[PDB]
Structure formats: C-alpha cells, structure tokens
Structure 1
Amino acid sequence: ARGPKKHLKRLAAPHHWLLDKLSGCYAPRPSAGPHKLRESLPLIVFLRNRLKYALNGREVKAILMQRHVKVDGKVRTDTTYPAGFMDVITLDATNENFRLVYDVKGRFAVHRITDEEASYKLGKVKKVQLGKKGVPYVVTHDGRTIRYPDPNIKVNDTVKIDLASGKITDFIKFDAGKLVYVTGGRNLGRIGTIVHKERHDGGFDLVHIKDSLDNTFVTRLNNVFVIGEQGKPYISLPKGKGIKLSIAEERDRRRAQQ
C-alpha cells in the first residue's frame, strides 16, 4: 500500500464485535482515538448491534448528530469513535449509563450503571515521565495525560479519574493480593487476585492470578488491570463476576434456569 488504510472487511474485523458475516462486505473501521483498533468497540456497533436502538447506520448518524451520546462526559459525533475498556457511555434521554466491560466470554457486555458510579473511571498507568518545564505527568491506557500526579504512582498502577475534572481521585498500587481484571489473551474477561509476579529482565513479565474458585492461571503483565482490593472492587462488575465456567456446568445452569 502507498498509505494508511481506510477500509475494513467484515471477516477481518475483530471477532468479539459479533458481526454477521453475510449482512454486507465491509465493517466499521474505528477511527483513530483513545483505544487501539482491535481493542475498541465503535459506537455504531454499540448502538445498533448491542442496544438495538438504531436499525441501520443512518439512524446511528441521526442519533449522534443530535448530541445525545456522551463518551466519558464529552459529546461525540463520529459514528466510528473507538469506545473501549472502562469508558462511560451516557445516553441522557434514555436515562442510561453504561460501562464497557468484557464478559467472561471475552466480549464487550452491556452493563448498566448508576450515575454516581458513572462519575469516574479507572485507568492503568502506562507511563510516568517528566514533561517540559519539569512537570511530571502520567499517561494511562486510554491516552489521557494527567499532570502533577501523586509521586507514589508508578507504572502498572491504577488511577481513579474523575471525568468532570480529569484529575486523579485515588490510586491502587500493583501488589500481591490485589483484585485484577484480564484485558487480553484467551483468559480475557476473567477476574482474580494476584499471587506472584515473575520478573524477566528484557522480556515479558508474567503474573499468576487465582480466581475465586481457586483455579489459577498465568498471564502476561500487559494484559492485567488492577481494579481494587479483594472483595472490594472500585467498579461494579458484570454478571458472573468474571468467573470462568466449564461447558458442562454452563449446560447444567442453562437447563436449570430454563
């Protein structure tokens, strides 16, 4: 190619969007934004294919141009705005607030939240560095640059960002016994407690996570997101509480509830 691509075939689109393979030939390409392409849910798919509010792309554009959709407390109008992990989607007319969280199956789940819990978000500190004029700043997983951080905040910590002011309200250190959420890999969507961090200089760090059912799994450190202390999450978790269930047990539960 001679430049950046602007099209996305349906088959090449991220699996977890759950797009029909025969509805069309192309899929929404998320525009550049806070989140990466493969780890983002564009607003069109959220409003049309998940909430079923809009029947087709044109109605989604009609919704957005009315300025009813807010992402992280700011109005967005791009149909392909890449909403992602820990972003708050507010629809005032419906009096609805959503937080985008992966369910156990690894897909973004429609999770309804109260307004108070919608007042803030959580961000993984991706970088801590001194800016120009000797001003420290922190860059989070969603690309927010926050100046004058608390000095104790280090990389891989979690910061609770208030959306109204864009400032850090509190922070959680990455330590053993903390509650964490998996945001990548085959263990995507699971929740557990840290047990031990293996360090490999010049390589990818590994973290052992024990679930509430005492099952253990190892995951690369880049895919871990600290969300609180054990039993005291700082956000409301989706149904299932991040517990992975075997196929047989899922069958049993499904038959029972039916």
Structure 2
Amino acid sequence: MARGPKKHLKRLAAPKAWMLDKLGGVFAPRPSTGPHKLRESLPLLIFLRNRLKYALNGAEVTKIVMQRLVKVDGKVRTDPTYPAGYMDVITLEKTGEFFRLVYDVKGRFVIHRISAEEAKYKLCKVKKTQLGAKGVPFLVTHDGRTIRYPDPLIHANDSVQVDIASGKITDYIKFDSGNLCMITGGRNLGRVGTVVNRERHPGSFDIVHIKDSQGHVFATRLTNVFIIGKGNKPYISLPKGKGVKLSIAEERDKRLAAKTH
C-alpha cells in the first residue's frame, strides 16, 4: 500500500472482452475487490447497461440495484460495481431472466438464459486443498467460496458442483483425459472439451494438450482450464455452437447463410 491504491481505471485499459465502447466516456467501471479477479470478472454495469440494454445510463442502474431487483447467487449484492466473475448465476426472477457467464467461441460474453433448476446448482473449480483451517480440514474453491470438511478424495485442480442456496457439494468430476473442459483466459479460450494429453513440466507451469471434436489441437497453461463434464457429457446448458473456432471464410459462411437478402 503506497500512494494508491489505484481507485480508477480509464478507457482502453479494461480488457476488451468486455465489448466496451470508445467514444464519449473516458473510463471503465473498475470493479471493487469481489469474489473474482480483475481481468476475469464481468460486472453488472457492463452487462445490464450495454449488452442486456435494459438500463440506459449509469444513473439508471442506481435505482434498480437499490430497489433490490437483481440478486446474484442468492445474495442481493446492492453495490452496482460488484465484479461478478465466471460461472456465477445471475438470479434475476423478473421477468425470469436466469443468466450465467460462459465465455464465447470468440472469447466474449453472451446474453444467454438458464433455467431455475440450473440456477439452483452451479459448477466451481478449486485451486488448493487446505489442512489447518476449521477445525482440522478445509477446501478453497475458485470463486471465493469456502468448503470446510469435504469428502477426502477430491484433491486440488478439480471442478465440483455445489448448490448455491446451500453450503454443500452436490457433484464432483475428475481431472482425467476423457473429460469435457473449458478454457478461461488464454489465446485458445472458449472451446468445449475434449482433452487427451497433458505433460507435467518439471518446475513449472505444465501446459495441457486439449483437442476439439473435429481434431484441431490447441493448448494453454493450467490456469485456464475449467473441467465442465465427462466425455461429451456436460453439466450445464450450453451457449451457441460449441466453441468450434472456425475459419474467417467459415465465419463468412454464416454471414451469407443465416441472412436475408
């Protein structure tokens, strides 16, 4: 802590996966130290004003969150600049919104609705498995949620499924090369499955060799993986077409096929 602590963030320095504009304004929202990181989060002012487009300006947000409409993950979170990172359930019951955050094929975010049962549970990664906290055992997740006294076979670097309205774990899956995965924050980010290989670097930062369903190989470091199911067996409702990362000409194929002219 020295002459800071950098309580602003201007235009053009926010991560451009926010789909942030350029003109007029000269600032980013700059979220406040919430349950996720800086470049990984996606707050309410970004989503509701500019892409959900139900709040017109920033002062329009100051009513709805203070009139207690949006609650995320069961808590109301009345601060407008709550960071609201990945794999979190936007529990907006009016008019039955039920949103989550899954990264795009193009790495951005998407307006996508989930069900109310899909709002009851959620999937969450862990970073370490800790012994020493209350009383003897502990477990730390990815999103600032804590687990004391878990089942002793779930080790670190796994992804478990919890009910947010409870404090229990409902499901866990293994770290195996037959599992469905999600890349979070890499160059090849936003592809679903379908890993077959990993190579443990002897000190350090092992990258993983993840392929797709069409045989295209890709990779990233270990901090990006989000294991999202078994062999072609997800645990969520998915966004649009399956992280396939086609060519620009194939991207131009949807520019000509699904258009009226």
Identity of aligned residues (%): 75
Match of 2:117 in 1: 116
Deviation digits for residues 88-147 of structure 1, max 9, x if unmatched? 002112111001111111112111001011111111111111133543111111011111
Contact 2:187–2:220 (CA under 8 A) maintained in structure 1 = no
Q: Distance in 2 between matches of 1:53 and 1:135?
A: 47
CA separation of 1:191 and 1:74: change in aligned 2, threshold 3 A: same
Q: Evaluate the alpha carbon distance shift between residue 215 and residue 64 of structure 1 in structure 2; reply closer, same or farther with a 3 A threshold.
A: same
- Cα distance 1:133–1:116, how it changes in 2: closer, same or farther (>3 A)? closer
Distance 1:151 1:203 in 2: 26
1:147-162 mapped onto 2 (5 Å cutoff): 147-162=148-163
Q: Distance in 1 between matches of 2:24 and 2:40?
A: 23
Distance 2:40 2:173 in 1: 23
1:182 — aligned with what?
183
1:15 alignment counterpart: 16
- After TM superposition, the score normalised by the length of structure 2 is 0.96
Equivalent position of 1:87 in the other structure = 88
SS in 2 for 1:213: coil
Distance 2:235 2:45 in 1: 28
- Aligned mates of 2:162, 2:134 — CA distance in 1: 24
Please say if residues 195 and 212 of structure 2, whose CA atoms lie closer than 8 Å, have aligned partners that are also in contact: no
2:44 touches 2:81 (CA, 8 Å); kept in 1? yes
Does 2:170 correspond to 1:169? yes
Name 2:104's counterpart in structure 1: 103
1:70 Cα deviation from its structure 2 partner: 1.0
The Cα offsets for residues 195-247 of structure 1, whole Å up to 9 and x where unpaired, read as 11100122101111110111111211111110001211011111111211110
SS at match of 1:248: helix
Distance apart, 1:37 and its partner CA: 0.9
What is the match of residue 37 of structure 1? 38
Q: Quote the residue 2:142 is aligned against.
A: 141
Indicate whether 1:257 and 2:238 are aligned.
no
Which structure 2 segments of 5+ residues have no match? none
| Partner Cα distance (2:91, 2:73) in 1 | 8
Quick one: distance in 2 between partners of 1:255 and 1:137?
Answer: 54
TM-score, length of structure 1 as denominator length: 0.97
Instruction: Judging by fraction of residues, say which structure has more strand.
Output: 1
Quote the offset at 1:188 in angstroms: 1.2
Count matched residues. Answer: 258
Q: Is the 8 A contact 2:134 2:148 kept in 1?
A: no
1:239 has 2:209 as partner: no
2:258 partner letter: Q
What amino acid is the match of 1:83?
A
What is the rounded CA distance, in whole Å, between the counterparts of 2:167 and 2:87 in structure 1?
Answer: 14
Hey, what does 1:215 align to over in structure 2?
Answer: 216
Instruction: Supply the AA of the counterpart residue of 2:51.
Output: R
Deviations 1:6-38, CA, capped at 9 Å, x for gaps: 111011111111111112111100111111011
5+ residue gaps, structure 1, are none
